[PDB]
Amino acid sequence: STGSATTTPIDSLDDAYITPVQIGTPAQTLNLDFDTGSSDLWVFSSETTASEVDGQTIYTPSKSTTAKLLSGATWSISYGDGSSSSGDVYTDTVSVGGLTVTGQAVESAKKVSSSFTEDSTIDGLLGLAFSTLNTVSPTQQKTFFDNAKASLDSPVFTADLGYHAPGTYNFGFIDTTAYTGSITYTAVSTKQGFWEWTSTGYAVGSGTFKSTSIDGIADTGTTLLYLPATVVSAYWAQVSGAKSSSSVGGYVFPCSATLPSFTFGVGSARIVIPGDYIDFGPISTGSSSCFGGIQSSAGIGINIFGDVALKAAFVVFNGATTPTLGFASK
């Protein structure tokens, strides 16, 4: 079987992308954030504290003929930026782009933190990292990827994120139309639950490639590209008005500048991030300063290849028994 869905950015800054998922019978369509950096499928529901629900579409398990309560099971989760939800667990039918998995655990939010309630466009997350990260207790539950791999035509999914435009997630096959050249694969380490990989180094604009290990995560559900402090300083040294700003949290530069591109190594291949992609957007509407799309991971503690990075590529998540990550230029 395969599956194909359109992913759209939630805003004019590509902060995140949503893809419609059909849960339950008859189908309730929610717009989820497909997050290769977590392993929980969770939804705003008829269970969610009312005062914590603003604009989102909810999942009502009571109207799904296929839903069953997974008895005893709870979950609680916090993320990178501070936000957090918890609740209880149903299994139900979940379809993405026509690919259908039955008995999928669908974590029902009893409570959500303020940044979730504030973002009217995301109805939940669908986790696509390794199932070892799943927060359901006392028995952890598999991701929709894991649950679908018995039926996929191949055990893979691809992410084809657009620049201020829609794109695609595909499951179970590789669209040889969506990219140029060939894919290069590099090994993944599952030791901490992530899509974790070693980039072989980096170049700024038309300057030399520097061979340096940079270990990190491919995270479709982090907005930016978070690099070690010295690699980031090397990049913004090339843009004359950029500075580290304590007030805004990171490197800012005149919206006026033409930013150099940023190249990252995948084994012997190179993916170039065009410099327009690293212009994140102005700091406030009408400002003359712009927020940099490449920031220090020093705070976060681990390097994340975020949407700024992955949206310049075509990316294959190879979930075979030994997984690999594939990048191609597009």
Binding site: D15, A16, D33, D35, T36, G37, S38, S39, D40, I77, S78, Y79, G80, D81, L125, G127, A129, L133, T135, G193, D219, T220, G221, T222, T223, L224, I300, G301, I302, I304
Partner: peptide, 6 residues
């Protein structure tokens, strides 16, 4: 922005 399971 947003940083998704730290």
């Amino acid at each position: 922005x947003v940083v998704x399971a730290x």
